[PDB]
């Protein structure tokens, strides 16, 4: 698990 | 929605792995053809030239691309 650290996503509805 | 705001294509600005089976997985720098709205935070589309790669994605993870 070396991958990039993307921002939090919005929640789903 | 994206249609009403003249969004046809966007480019992804982050990497993204689907967390649900209706979500699009992508890396940064890919072009998406935007084809609908999931809700106020999520659009729907497919990868340009690879239409089998399709699903919902965050509005905040893309930037509008001109024709």
Structural commentary:
Chain A has 13 residues and is largely without helices or strands. Helices cover 0% and strands 0% of the residues of chain A. Chain A is elongated. Chain B is mainly β. Chain B has one domain. Chain B has no helices and five strands. Chain B has a five-stranded antiparallel sheet with strand order 4-3-2-1-5, with no helix packed on it. Chain B is globular and about 25 Å long. Chain B starts with 8 loop residues before the first strand and ends with a strand. Classes of the chains: A little secondary structure (13), B mainly beta (67). Chain B: It is found in: Cytoplasm; Membrane; Golgi apparatus; Golgi apparatus, trans-Golgi network. Chain B: It comes from Mus musculus. Chain B: This is Arf-GAP with SH3 domain, ANK repeat and PH domain-containing protein 1. It is classed as protein binding. Keywords: SH3, high-affinity, protein binding. It forms a dimeric assembly.
